[model samples]
Target: TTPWTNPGLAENFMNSFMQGLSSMPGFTASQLDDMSTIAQSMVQSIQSLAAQGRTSPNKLQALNMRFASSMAEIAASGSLSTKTSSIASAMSNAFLQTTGVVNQPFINEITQLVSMFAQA
Candidate 1:
């Protein structure tokens, strides 16, 4: 599946995410549903950044390697610490990895933040 075309797909994404996907606390299901929509749409819009035309093969390859790494770790970590940082790091790294160049100084901040939430 393209996975991107489905309108409410990310709602399910978050479901599968938490389900490991497991159950979550904190928000009402409806509230949570809307939250998923917000997060999902934001995800695609950010991805569409490169789809519009940016350049860099090395950047692309380099970034995807990290993306795969991030997702892999996110899944395992999410599986392990499903209650906390596993899910936490995924979002942190998603925004980091997908949004731009690995060499960007902005991308440079990952070192400082990756651990903040997982341990907290």
Candidate 2:
């Protein structure tokens, strides 16, 4: 199997993704907190999958689909409070600014995860 464990990678990626999101202009402190919590949860879920050593392509696809589904649930029905929403907006702005170069395939995986929530 691969050397990268799921839990560590998931946490690392969540932190990276959130940091990337934070760089954008409009995100607020609360949104960052919400996103951080959500990311941690998502990472734990994915880490479980990884720990099982199930890294098949189909599995990855399913993982992404599930992540997308989760995001949709958030965008459609989750609560972000006020400060969190502001941070979320800032993240949105950052995403818009770096929709191309900065965002990679791995990052795209994260986008799929986040976009699931954003409903885009």
Highest-scoring model, lDDT: 2
The 10-residue segment of model 1 with minimum total lDDT is: 99-108
TM-score per prediction, in order, is 0.32, 0.48
What's the lDDT for candidate 2? 0.50
Cα displacement (angstroms), candidate 2, residue 86, comes to: 12
lDDT of 1 at 95: 35
- Compose the digit string of candidate 1's lDDT tens values, residues 61-112: 4443443344333333313334234434343344334332222332233322
Q: Count the backbone clashes (under 3 Å) in each candidate.
A: 3, 10
| Tens-place lDDT digits, model 2, residues 1-120 | 211234564465456557765654444556546556666666766777777886555665566566545544444442423323433444444434544223334444544565555545
Residue runs of model 2 more than 4 Å from their true location after superposition: 1-7, 69-120
The CA lDDT at 17 in model 2 is 56
